[PDB]
Design an enzyme around this catalytic site. Structure first.
Site, PDB file in Angstrom:
ATOM      1  N   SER A 168       2.832  -4.545  -1.211  1.00  0.00           N
ATOM      2  CA  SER A 168       1.708  -3.991  -0.455  1.00  0.00           C
ATOM      3  C   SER A 168       1.530  -4.677   0.896  1.00  0.00           C
ATOM      4  O   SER A 168       2.392  -4.548   1.770  1.00  0.00           O
ATOM      5  CB  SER A 168       0.407  -3.954  -1.270  1.00  0.00           C
ATOM      6  OG  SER A 168      -0.079  -5.246  -1.574  1.00  0.00           O
TER       7      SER A 168
ATOM      8  N   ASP B 103       2.302   7.001  -3.055  1.00  0.00           N
ATOM      9  CA  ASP B 103       1.679   5.697  -3.229  1.00  0.00           C
ATOM     10  C   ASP B 103       0.165   5.851  -3.294  1.00  0.00           C
ATOM     11  O   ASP B 103      -0.430   6.561  -2.479  1.00  0.00           O
ATOM     12  CB  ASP B 103       2.077   4.799  -2.059  1.00  0.00           C
ATOM     13  CG  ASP B 103       1.512   3.407  -2.176  1.00  0.00           C
ATOM     14  OD1 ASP B 103       2.186   2.542  -2.773  1.00  0.00           O
ATOM     15  OD2 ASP B 103       0.401   3.175  -1.660  1.00  0.00           O
TER      16      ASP B 103
ATOM     17  N   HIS C 137       0.427   2.588  -8.132  1.00  0.00           N
ATOM     18  CA  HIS C 137       0.215   1.378  -7.348  1.00  0.00           C
ATOM     19  C   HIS C 137       1.007   0.204  -7.911  1.00  0.00           C
ATOM     20  O   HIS C 137       0.779  -0.938  -7.493  1.00  0.00           O
ATOM     21  CB  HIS C 137      -1.270   1.007  -7.305  1.00  0.00           C
ATOM     22  CG  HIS C 137      -1.837   0.645  -8.642  1.00  0.00           C
ATOM     23  ND1 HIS C 137      -2.567   1.528  -9.407  1.00  0.00           N
ATOM     24  CD2 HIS C 137      -1.778  -0.507  -9.352  1.00  0.00           C
ATOM     25  CE1 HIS C 137      -2.933   0.937 -10.531  1.00  0.00           C
ATOM     26  NE2 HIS C 137      -2.467  -0.299 -10.521  1.00  0.00           N
TER      27      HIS C 137
END
Ligand SMILES: Cc1ccc(Sc2ccc3n[nH]c(=O)n3n2)cc1
Length: 343
Positions: free
Chosen positions: A145, A242, A288
């Site tokens: 991330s 995503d 995620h």
């Protein structure tokens, strides 16, 4: 377990001025070093960072960090959990700068917080050299991330300092997980990042900075714009759908035609930005999940898992290889058309 080391240069700090650091588990005999950048969004102004300090303080301070941490996923030392680099030297760098790893500004009389993410990476690398990194053959800078974007922003600077420090034999490579975003239109309604960069004194890779120029450095936070400017080999892992991308796009999941077309176009835009990324893994999943999860081995694209693709990438860096592919992008157009998506 990886053991905590606070940085010896205590001027390289987390947001609140406490020392940054890294968790290290040495694997002597191994010439492979994995440096993983933790994610966790960011904060872009005084009030927004103040709120993060109440309820997300570990992302802003080392005062409460644990002694040790367990390596999981790509950071695991068990070959069953990590078929890729289970025997590597493992480094987990906590994210405590709230700057997507781009900052180079200290606390001062004028700054409530320090944003030193880019300097934290440099100092970790420098202090690791005295701990065996000097003998490495490969330094893989990985991250998820915010840390995935941090890889794209920092991999070439790590390669640069190692050359300037006198270690040209170390091959620096990047693995950017879940940090490849599109500056698209929301389904229903860049500025936080642009305001973030000014607040952090954020730095972007030099070639990208020279293309986009003054005031436009935010462009370099988007993988499809910064990636072609990079010299180090970078493997890109990105879900086609995503969850963070869909969240910023104001999509939360019967789906009617407007939203169906939006979601399908987003996957196609994604797929398109990866067309010229030779080392990539992009499953058609809404997720995620990140590469430090224990079951990261389970997802496959075209029958190939990510640990296999990364191993094939290693082989490529010694003309495609028979049966050992590195470009794995799903072509099917809807979340979880790939049966191996995380449940
Ligand atoms: C363009 C850009 C914007 C924000 C970031 S930072 C981020 C983005 C997702 C995400 N999901 N979970 C998590 O911690 N993050 N952090 C990086 C690049």
């Amino acid at each position: 377990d990886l053991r905590l080391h606070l940085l010896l240069n205590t001027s390289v700090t987390c947001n609140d001025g406490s020392p940054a650091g890294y968790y290290l588990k040495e694997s002597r005999g191994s010439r492979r070093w994995l440096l993983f950048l933790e994610g966790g969004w960011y904060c872009f102004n005084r009030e927004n960072c103040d709120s993060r300090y109440d309820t997300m303080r570990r992302l802003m301070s080392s005062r409460d960090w644990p002694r040790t941490r367990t390596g999981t996923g790509i950071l695991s030392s068990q070959p069953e959990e990590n078929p890729y680099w289970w025997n590597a030297n493992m480094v987990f760098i906590p994210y405590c700068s709230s700057d997507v790893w781009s900052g180079a500004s200290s606390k001062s009389e004028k700054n409530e917080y320090a944003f030193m993410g880019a300097l934290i990476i440099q100092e970790v690398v420098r202090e690791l050299l005295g701990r065996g990194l000097s003998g490495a053959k490969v330094l893989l800078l990985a991250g998820s991330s915010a840390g995935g974007t941090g890889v794209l922003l920092n991999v070439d600077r790590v390669a640069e300092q190692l050359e300037k420090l006198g270690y040209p034999a170390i091959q620096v490579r990047g693995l950017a997980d879940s940090g490849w975003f599109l500056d698209n239109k929301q389904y229903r309604h860049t500025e936080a990042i642009r305001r973030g960069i000014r607040y952090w004194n954020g730095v972007v890779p030099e070639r990208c900075r020279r293309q986009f120029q003054e005031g436009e450095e935010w462009n370099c936070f988007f993988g499809y714009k910064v990636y072609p400017t990079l010299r180090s080999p970078v493997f890109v892992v990105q879900w086609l759908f995503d969850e963070a991308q869909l969240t910023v796009d104001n999509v939360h999941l019967p789906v009617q035609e407007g939203l169906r077309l939006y979601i399908q176009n987003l996957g196609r835009e994604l797929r398109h930005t990866l067309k010229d990324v030779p080392a990539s893994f992009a499953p058609a999943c809404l997720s995620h999940e990140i590469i430090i999860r224990s079951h990261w081995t389970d997802v496959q694209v075209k029958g190939t898992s990510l640990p296999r693709a990364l191993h094939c990438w290693d082989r490529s860096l010694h003309t495609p290889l028979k049966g050992c592919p590195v470009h794995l992008v799903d072509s099917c157009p809807w979340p979880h058309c790939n049966p191996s998506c995380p449940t």
